[model samples]
Target chain A: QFAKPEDAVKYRQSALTLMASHFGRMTPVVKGQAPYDAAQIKANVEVLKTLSALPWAAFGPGTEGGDARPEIWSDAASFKQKQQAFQDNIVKLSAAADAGDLDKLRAAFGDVGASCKACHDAYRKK
Target chain B: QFAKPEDAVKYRQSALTLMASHFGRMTPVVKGQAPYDAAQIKANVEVLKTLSALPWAAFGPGTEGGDARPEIWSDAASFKQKQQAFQDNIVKLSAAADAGDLDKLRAAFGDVGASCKACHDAYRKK
Candidate 1:
């Protein structure tokens, strides 16, 4: 639905950049730097769930730019797999947040971060 | 949660920008330029519900930048009222989207858009 290649770039980047803000906000709690607030974390994960579905659609053909590597379009299957994994991690993280289990939260949070890192390693600019 | 002043700017702007993308996607449907897809619109409204709660916290002291006007910090009460109105409109839009009623969706969409404009006029840069 983007009008131009750059529009697509901006749209995708906006989604991903914004996702970083939402995701990073939980890090302090994950690292023990902030108190565990289950209600707040659960609320935050809902936003993550929303964002986790946005960037991928904007990665369609002829819409290339930003920090995205060509591998996203080339190795599409693997890229989709990574996206799925990250979303799956979000679900697990949601469960942890719901139960107020800090240990499970840590593991789920680490898995989600790993999914992000793995995707960036393969598909984003180094 | 922001480490620096500019970090708050970026964080709040990112949320606002992404919200625009999600909100604007329904413009064509509201204007009869595109067919109403109730399922898709409902899904999008879910994202809007998540986004409607963000951005305000990032507008704390020392976090002044982006297109935000001085009035946001100065006339804080009114700005908060505008935010509350916009979020209330979002709930109406969600109901319309949920019921698959195009006419109500259009009305609800316009109401939400108007709330956005009123806030921008009063609190955002002119």
Candidate 2:
């Protein structure tokens, strides 16, 4: 969608940040210091589940210009499988938050983290 | 510096992985689950404190490009201020981890999360 190189750079970065914020905000709640608000919990989970799906949309094989790793397109099938896991776990996490069950939230939270890491481990670099 | 665009893409993804792994791995320990050992605690804390600062080095005003975010260089001063907070809290966290104090770790963990959020809130795209 971004035409210029600079614009593409910003778009991809925005995509990355969207992904980061989802986890960053949730880290506090899971830690048990901040009291949980059902409304806030639901809101953040929605954001995470949505963002997890969106970052993948920005990839378009070799056609995309910018810092987007081509491996995203190169390993499209595997990436989709990873996304499925993230989406599935995020559903459980979101439901737990909505239901206001701490045990479910606690158990499911690690799974959510795992899903995110699994995707990053395969597709991201550092 | 990455010579190939793919390399930069990979590096950025890896950098993202480093950041994500810190949170995912720490999530379990922070949740009051699985007994905390001094060795494991210290190691993860060290990894986080180090990775917190390293994400910035990949950016250079107009250096090599891939999906690099310009805000990192564009608003350099504010970025540095956030980094200062991140590094400061990381120091405090490292000290707590070294001391093998759960209470101290719990207190400092929130602060560390905030530091990451502060940078993410201001400099990162979301």
Candidate 3:
């Protein structure tokens, strides 16, 4: 849908926001700010795994609007490197979730959050 | 989160809405309403696969107060059957996406939609 830039933008926005939504599910449990449920952690880990692979692909040409900055395309290499780091941490997070160790999951969750923050600071609008 | 009924409801709502958001990405391309992109289809398919699993588990006891009806719990067997059918179609849709066959993807997409409609018709509050 590159021919229609709005559709492409919407697609990527939906994908990215969905990733954020699932990631939000992990925070309370990981931080002990809410009741911990291993099942919920496991479920969100699986969703995060799939969503982590989605948003970056949607950031192609014509997907330039929204909160995503020009740097996402202008400095594609750096953007992709940051994206890769996020994905790598997501994989580690998934592993920790599967191990059913809350401590491991919490540490990995923070790693993934840092990776996300790095990309957002560089590439996302305020 | 089940200890907090509102939290459970919110979790399921977030999960279900996220599923619909990703599913929306396919409509235009699949129905010839927009330009077809194999990459978009593939990405959405992967996201859908994971989301298809997350929402149902979130619909456990104490997950009321949303559009979800009591029937989702009272009629457990039928709801599970409908949910299973949706999951099955999602697997088929994922397979078609992997095959990179647009026609197959469209057909499977329709099947998934039908499965969703069936469950909604029975269980979702208007």
Top-DockQ structure, candidate number? 1
Comparing only chain B with the true structure, the TM-scores of all models are 0.95, 0.81, 0.92
State how far residue B125 of model 2 sits from its true place (Å): 18
Give one digit per residue, the lDDT tens place, for model 2 in B14-112: 555545555556655767885778798897776566556555655544444554456767778877788787889889989999999988887888888
Q: For candidate 1, what is the DockQ-based docking class? A: medium
Top TM-score hit: 1
Error of 3 at B28 (Å): 9.8
TM-score list, all predictions: 0.95, 0.46, 0.67
Residue range B22-51, candidate 3, lDDT tens digits: 786678888788877778788778867887
Candidate order, lDDT descending: 1, 3, 2
Q: Model 1, B5-62: lDDT tens per residue?
A: 8988887877787788789888888898998788989998888888777889989997
Flag the better candidate by DockQ, 2 or 3: 3
A best-first ranking of the candidates according to their TM-score comes to 1, 3, 2
Could you tell me the lDDT of residue A42 within candidate 3? 83
Candidate 2: where are CA atoms >4 Å away? A4-9, A63-69, B1-126
Worst 10 residues of 2 chain B by lDDT: B60-69
- After best superposition, candidate 2 residue B107: deviation in angstroms? 52
How far out, in Å, is residue A71 in model 3?
1.7
What are the interface RMSDs of all the models? Answer: 1.6, 13.8, 4.3
Fnat of candidate 3, please?
0.13
lDDT of each: 0.87, 0.68, 0.81
- Give each prediction's root-mean-square deviation over alpha carbons: 1.3, 18.7, 4.7
